């Protein structure tokens, strides 16, 4: 069994999936696209026209990163990325909710800042910034002084925490997350040494087409 994954170089949503595939020992081909350019092939698979898209070997696709991760956990349960118990499942998923919500607000911010300056909405930017900073502070609070986000070993919660912090350094660089949250700095440094992370570090892509 092998997969193909439509991905973009900065994409945190795709990074979660890339990390999960590697952690589960599932081979895959990375199919890099700019999903904001008219050349993207995402609409052929995802009615929502977003990546990541997991392309299945016998045909069809799975989209929406959190859903792809649930799909992978059911199809390939070993090694697990979630704890076996419901409380642990829910704890890991809460980190993922926060990661995703922060990332959504970062993307909305990025595209607001692509508008002509005169047309940028200060209240919309401020609204999204409260989500970014407040969501991040909550991830840091939940981690506290512990070695792992959930329990005693690597889980989805660590995928989420490491992904969002790595993404902020690319697409919300003004926020000194390492200084405000040294616990996240230390966790990030541990996680970024894992091969799954080291093979998926974000960088900024080039967007050519007009989006806004």
Ligand X SMILES: N[C@@H](CCC(=O)N[C@@H](CS(=O)(=O)O)C(=O)NCC(=O)O)C(=O)O
State the residues that interact with ligand X by CB under 6 A: 8, 10-11, 13-14, 35, 49-52, 64-66, 100, 107, 127
Q: Which of 67, 153, 189, 201 binds a copy of itself (CB under 8 A)?
A: 67
Query: How many residues contact a copy of itself, by CB under 8 A?
Result: 38
Residue 4 phi, psi dihedral angles, 5° rounding? -125, 140
CB closer to ligand X, 155 vs 183: 155
2 binds a copy of itself (CB under 8 A): no
CB closer to ligand X, 129 vs 190: 129
* Site string (154-173) toward a copy of itself, x via CB under 8 A: --------------------
- Cis ω for the linkage preceding 79 (within 30 of 0): yes
Q: Least Å distance between CB 102 and ligand X?
A: 12
Q: Least Å distance between CB 82 and ligand X?
A: 17
Q: Which of 70, 110, 175, 207 binds a copy of itself (CB under 8 A)?
A: 70
Binding site for a copy of itself (CB under 8 A): 43, 47-50, 63-64, 66-67, 70-71, 74, 86, 89-90, 93-94, 97-98, 101-102, 105, 111, 115, 119, 121, 123-124, 127, 130-131, 134-135, 137-138, 210-212
């Amino acid at each position: 069994t092998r997969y193909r994954l439509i991905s973009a170089t900065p994409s945190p949503y795709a990074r979660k999936v890339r990390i999960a595939l590697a952690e589960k020992g599932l081979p895959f081909e990375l199919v890099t696209e700019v999903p904001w350019d008219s050349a993207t092939t995402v609409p052929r698979h995802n009615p929502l026209e977003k990546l990541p898209v997991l392309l299945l070997p016998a045909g069809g696709s799975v989209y929406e990163s959190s859903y792809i991760l649930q799909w992978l956990e059911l199809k390939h349960p070993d090694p697990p990325l979630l704890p076996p118990d419901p409380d642990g499942v829910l704890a890991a998923r809460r980190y993922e909710v926060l990661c995703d919500g922060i990332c959504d607000a970062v993307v909305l911010t990025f595209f607001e800042r692509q508008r002509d300056e005169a047309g940028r909405s200060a209240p919309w930017l401020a609204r999204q910034r409260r989500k970014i900073e407040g969501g991040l502070a909550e991830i840091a609070r939940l981690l506290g002084d512990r070695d792992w986000t959930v329990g005693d070993r690597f889980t989805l919660g660590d995928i989420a925490a490491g992904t969002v912090t790595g993404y902020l350094s690319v697409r919300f660089p003004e926020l000194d997350w390492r200084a405000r949250h040294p616990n996240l700095a230390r966790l990030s440094d541990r996680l970024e040494a894992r091969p799954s992370f080291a093979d998926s570090v974000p960088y900024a892509q080039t967007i050519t087409d007009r989006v806004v």
